Amino acid sequence: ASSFVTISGTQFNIDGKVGYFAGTNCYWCSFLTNHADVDSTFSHISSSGLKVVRVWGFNDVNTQPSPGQIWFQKLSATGSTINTGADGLQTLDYVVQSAEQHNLKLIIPFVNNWSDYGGINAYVNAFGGNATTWYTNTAAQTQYRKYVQAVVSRYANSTAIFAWELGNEPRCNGCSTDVIVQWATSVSQYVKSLDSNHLVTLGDEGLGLSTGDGAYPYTYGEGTDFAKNVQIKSLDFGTFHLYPDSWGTNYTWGNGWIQTHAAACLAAGKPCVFEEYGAQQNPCTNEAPWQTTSLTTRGMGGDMFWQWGDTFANGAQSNSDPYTVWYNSSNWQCLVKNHVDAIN
Numbered sequence: 001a002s003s004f005v006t007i008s009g010t011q012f013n014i015d016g017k018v019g020y021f022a023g024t025n026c027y028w029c030s031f032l033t034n035h036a037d038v039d040s041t042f043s044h045i046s047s048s049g050l051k052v053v054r055v056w057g058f059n060d061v062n063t064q065p066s067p068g069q070i071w072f073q074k075l076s077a078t079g080s081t082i083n084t085g086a087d088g089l090q091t092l093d094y095v096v097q098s099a100e101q102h103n104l105k106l107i108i109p110f111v112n113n114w115s116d117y118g119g120i121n122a123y124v125n126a127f128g129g130n131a132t133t134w135y136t137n138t139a140a141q142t143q144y145r146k147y148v149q150a151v152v153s154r155y156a157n158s159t160a161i162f163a164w165e166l167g168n169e170p171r172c173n174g175c176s177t178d179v180i181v182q183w184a185t186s187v188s189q190y191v192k193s194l195d196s197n198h199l200v201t202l203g204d205e206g207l208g209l210s211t212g213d214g215a216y217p218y219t220y221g222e223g224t225d226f227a228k229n230v231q232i233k234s235l236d237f238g239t240f241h242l243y244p245d246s247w248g249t250n251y252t253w254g255n256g257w258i259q260t261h262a263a264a265c266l267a268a269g270k271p272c273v274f275e276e277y278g279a280q281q282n283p284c285t286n287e288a289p290w291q292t293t294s295l296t297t298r299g300m301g302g303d304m305f306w307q308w309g310d311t312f313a314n315g316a317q318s319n320s321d322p323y324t325v326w327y328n329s330s331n332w333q334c335l336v337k338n339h340v341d342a343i344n
C-alpha cells in the first residue's frame, strides 16, 4: 500500500503500519545525474529494511556553475532564478519517482544553515545583512518562500513525502530564542497553506533544553529553545541530532541526550525523530547503545544515522565523510541489518 504519512498516537503510520522506523541520511542522492545510480542506491536502502531517507531539497549558488553542473536556485540582487531544467529540479523529480517505486518516504529540507550547497550565506551575498538578520530580511525571506513554493508544489500530492523540513540545522548564534520561534511559526503556516497532506518539522539539532546536565548543547547560545519550538502548532514532530566529537562531550553522554529530548516531545504530545547521529571513532561500539536507547524510550518515533555510503555500476563511489556507513560493510551489519532485526 501507499498512503500519506500521518501520526497515530505518538507513533508514525507509514503505508498503514503504525510503529517505530529506521531510516538514513543521503544528502547527495538529490544531486545524482545518472538515474541508474539513484535506483541502485534506493534498491539497497529498501532491501536493508529502512523506510525513510533524508535528502537535500536545496542547491543554492550566486553564479551559475560550469555547464552540466547541477543547481536548483541562483540568488542575485537583480533577480533570482529557480532552475526547473534537466540540470536543476528534474534531478530531485527522479529521486521522488524512485522513492515511489521502492516504497520509501523522504524528509526534504529547503535551505542549509551552513554554507555547503550555498546556505543562508548565499542569501546574505545576494540580499545583504548577516547570518542572524537573515530570518527577518524581507528580500531574503521573499525569495526563500518563492523557492519553498516551487519545491512543495511539485510533490504536494505524492505519497512519497514523509515531511517538509524548514532547514538543515537552523541556528541564530547569540540571538533571542524568539527569532526562530516566530520565523518557524510563520514559515510552517505557509507550508501548510500550500499542502494539507504532509507533515512539517523544523530540522534543528535540538540545542537548548533545561532538563540536561548543563553541557554546551543544552545551553541557549545558538538561538534555539527545543521545548518552545516543539509546542508550535504547525510543526507535527520534533527533530534532534547528535555529534559528541564536534560538541566536546563523550559518547555515553548521548544516551541522556536522547532521553531528555524524547521526554520533551512526549510532554508536547508529539513524536520525536532522532534525525542525525555519528561517532568518528569505533562507530559499531559507540553508536549501537544509542540505537537501543532510542528504540526503547517512550516519545521516540524513529532514528536515521548520518550517513549512507554506496557505490555505482561504473565503479565510482558516492560522496562520503568520516561518519559514512558503507552498504554491505561490517558497520552496515552492525548498525543497519542488526538494528532493523531488533525493531522487527
Ligand SMILES: OC[C@H]1O[C@@H](O[C@H]2[C@H](O)[C@H](O)[C@H](O)O[C@@H]2CO)[C@@H](O)[C@@H](O)[C@@H]1O
Pocket: 114, 169, 205, 243, 246, 247
Ligand atoms: O553539529 C554538527 C554541525 O557542527 C557545526 O560546527 C559547530 C559545532 O557543532 C559546535 O556548535 C561549535 O560550537 O560550533 C561549530 C562551528 O560553528 C558545523 O561543523 C556543521 O557543518 C555541522 O553540521
Ligand SMILES: *[C@@H]1O[C@H](CO)[C@@H](O)[C@H](O)[C@H]1NC(C)=O
Pocket: 129, 130, 131, 132, 133
Ligand atoms: C549582525 O547584524 C546585526 C544587526 O546589525 C548585528 O546587531 C549583529 O551584531 C551582527 N553580527 C555580527 C557577527 O557581526
Ligand SMILES: *[C@@H]1O[C@H](CO)[C@@H](O)[C@H](O)[C@H]1NC(C)=O
Pocket: 156, 157, 194, 195, 196, 197
Ligand atoms: C492535492 O492535495 C490538495 C491538498 O494539499 C487537495 O486540495 C487537492 O484536491 C489534491 N489534488 C488532487 C487532484 O487530488
Ligand SMILES: *[C@@H]1O[C@H](CO)[C@@H](O)[C@H](O)[C@H]1NC(C)=O
Pocket: 213, 250, 252, 253
Ligand atoms: C562521561 O561523561 C559522563 C558525564 O557527562 C560521566 O558521568 C561518565 O563517567 C563519563 N563516561 C566515560 C566512559 O567517559
Ligand SMILES: *[C@@H]1O[C@H](CO)[C@@H](O)[C@H](O)[C@H]1NC(C)=O
Pocket: 328
Ligand atoms: C552484497 O553482499 C551480498 C553477499 O552477502 C552479495 O550477494 C551482493 O552482490 C552484494 N551487493 C553489492 C552491491 O555488492
